[PDB]
Structure formats: C-alpha cells, structure tokens
Amino acid sequence: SNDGVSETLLAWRHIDFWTSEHNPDLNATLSDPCTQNDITHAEEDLEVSFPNPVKASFKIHDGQEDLESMTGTSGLFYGFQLMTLDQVVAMTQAWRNVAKNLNKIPDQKSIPPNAVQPVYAHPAWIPLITDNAGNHIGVDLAPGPNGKYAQIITFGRDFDTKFVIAENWGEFLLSFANDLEAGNWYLVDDDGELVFRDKKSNGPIQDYFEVLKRRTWIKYQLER
Amino acid sequence: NDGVSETLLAWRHIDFWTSEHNPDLNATLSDPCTQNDITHAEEDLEVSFPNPVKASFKIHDGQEDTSGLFYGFQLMTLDQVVAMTQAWRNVAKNLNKRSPDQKSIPPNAVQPVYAHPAWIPLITDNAGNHIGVDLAPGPNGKYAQIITFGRDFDTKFVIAENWGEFLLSFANDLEAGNWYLVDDNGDGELVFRDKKSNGPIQDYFEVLKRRTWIKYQLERPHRD
C-alpha cells in the first residue's frame, strides 16, 4: 500500500548523494537494481511476498558487493552490510533450517513486549542486513499480537531479545539517512570505515545495534 | 490456489447433502459475496484473504436465518467476520496495556497468545469460540493454516493445512454417515457421531481436537 515506498525512494536519494559526497569507495559498493524477474524468482524460491518498500529498495540497489577488497565489504549501515537478493534467499533458507532443527537457547523476548514472536528463529523473518557474525536487521512477516506486519526487527545469534526498530523498511532507511545528515558519523583511517557517534551530544563511537536498541527502549517507554 | 479445488468440491458435497437431508439448513446458506464486498472487507481489516477463503465466500456469504452447518457451529457472514475480527483486535490491544497458559498443538504452530489481529474467525459456536484462518503462524506453523481459538481455547489446535482441506474433511464426515439429526417434537439440529464405531454423539470441537492429537502423534516418528 502507501506505507513506506515514498520513504524508501527518498531515503535512497539521500544515501546515494551523501555517500558520493563523503565516501565514494562506499558509494561504489551499492550494486545495480534487481530486475522484477530476479525478485519474482526469489519470491518463488522463498514462497513469500516482499513488502512494497522492500521491493522498491531492491529495485534501486541489489545490496552491496565490493569485488576488489581482500579485507571485506564495508557495511553501509555503520559497518553492517546490505545483503544482495541472493544472500537474502540463502540466509532465509539457512534460518529456516535452524527453525526446523529447534522443533526436532535462553529466554526469547520482545521490545515492545508481544510485538515480535518470542522465538530464536522464524521462517517469515527475512534478513536484509547482516553483521556477518550471525545477527540481522530484517522484515517480520509474522508479527506478535502487538506487532505490525512488515515491521523491521533485529534477530540472530546474539538477539535473545528482539527489537522493533521501525514500522516499515522505508522508515528505517530514512532514519539512517537522517543520522548521516545530522552528522552522526566518523570515518576511521587504516576514505575509511563508517561508525556512529551522536554529534550534538559529543557522544562516543557506538555500535549501531546498541543505538537502535536504546532508541527502541526509549520510544516504547515514552509511548506507554 | 492450494485448497481452492478442495473448497469448490466441499461446497458441492455440502450444498447437495444439505438439500437431500436437511433443506431447512440448506436455506440458511446465503448468496455469494461480490468481489467488491470482499475487497471492502480486506480494506477494513488490512489483510489478504487466502485464495480458498475468498473462493468459499464467493459461494456462500456465511449463513443467515441460523442453526449451524458445522454440527451446530455457524458459518459467519463477511460482515460478522469483520465485526468479530475487530472485537478480537480490541481484546489484543487491552491485553497489551496491562502486560492461564496459552499453548499450541502441534507445539510452536500457533502463537501462544489469547488473541492475535491476524486470526480471522470463519466459524463461531456463538459462545466465544472460533475456527478460523491463521495469517501469523508460529515457527512450526503454516501460513493460512486453520486453527481453533477463542474464550475456551487456552490450547489452540491446527485442524487443517488450509480452508479447503477443512471444508472437505467436514464434507467427508457428512458423506461417511457421521451424523445424527435431532428433531424437536423442523428437520432438526445436526450433531456428530462416529458411525463405524456406533459411537455416541460428540461435540465437533472435541472431535477436531482428538483428530489433531492423533495426526500429530502418528507423524512424530518421522523426522527424516
């Protein structure tokens, strides 16, 4: 519907421009668009309908690739990599295998409470971002009773507590773009690796997951 | 179109069975919904009805007097589905503001919650209990699986893989002779009995629960 598509397009305009201004090396990792056929093929494989804002994102960049880099790709989301469609399919399948094996882990929990299913893995959690260490940001196509369909969540190896970080994929991308524009960043030399800091408060370099978690906690508490 | 054929075939059996054995009940089966009626309900609830459920609605818009088709349980009109889903969405909201063990058979197939926005009631016992379609399954569930939920269903049961299989298993019970009419001194109230075992009248919920238990137990030996 009219729920995040516009935000996705606008976000990508800002991120495309910001990166080309401040970090061309990172800009050049942003892959060409997926085709509708690529998307159709992935939807057939996974037996899922991608939400509209997620499809729109894929039709702008099919993730990050960075061919020539012995070290590894530089994540666009403050070190975390935007996954290619092929990576999304492979990882979803991997997580579906985990979910099968768990049927045949400490207490699983949700912020806000009851927004995300209290489980280690679910077939309908589609990973879109990876820390390449077992953790993801993705889209939740089977929310808890106080969740929203296609809400954006954190899950994986180290996410016993899962967080709703955005209402849709568009809002998530836009809040990331706003962090870039507000100056909430530092590049590190070895154009460099992109890390988060809160500029207005002179905040320390922080892991972007911790930032997202704190913001979710705060937003939940203020709305209660 | 998984279950659509089964839906069409089931309705053929039930339409004919009822006209043969219980014309009073036949006459409660409403005219088809229009595509516009369905579109309007989908817009109101912000959901996509599974294909077999849409096909069912385009054959009968529930019952309108009405003593229930499904061994006393009433097939709900589209307007009743919308109203009841909204009612259950209000419950789900009230449980969040402030927050009997909720469980699933099979385990982890249905979310362990009292109410969920994405559980669409299609049948009512007119006492707070439902058979419906589950659009937010647990990690070992299937999208659009058919479940029992409501007032007295602290444990929820997956009774069919889709709405077509459910309707067809009902139609097969009718054809197998698993029924008994009850005349009040009126062609009478339809109740279930197991004909092959010459068994007593049973509540159809208990029958469905027992069949779910049995199916689950027989399948557990198979892991590969």
From Swiss-Prot, chain A:
Present with 5680 molecules/cell in log phase SD medium. Interacts with TYS1. Protein involved in the regulation of cell wall assembly and 1,3-beta-glucan synthesis, possibly through the transcriptional regulation of cell wall glucan and chitin synthesis. This is Cell wall assembly regulator SMI1. The chain holds residues 83 to 340 of 505 of the full protein. It is found in: Nucleus. It comes from the Eukaryota. Coiled coil: none annotated. Belongs to the KNR4/SMI1 family.
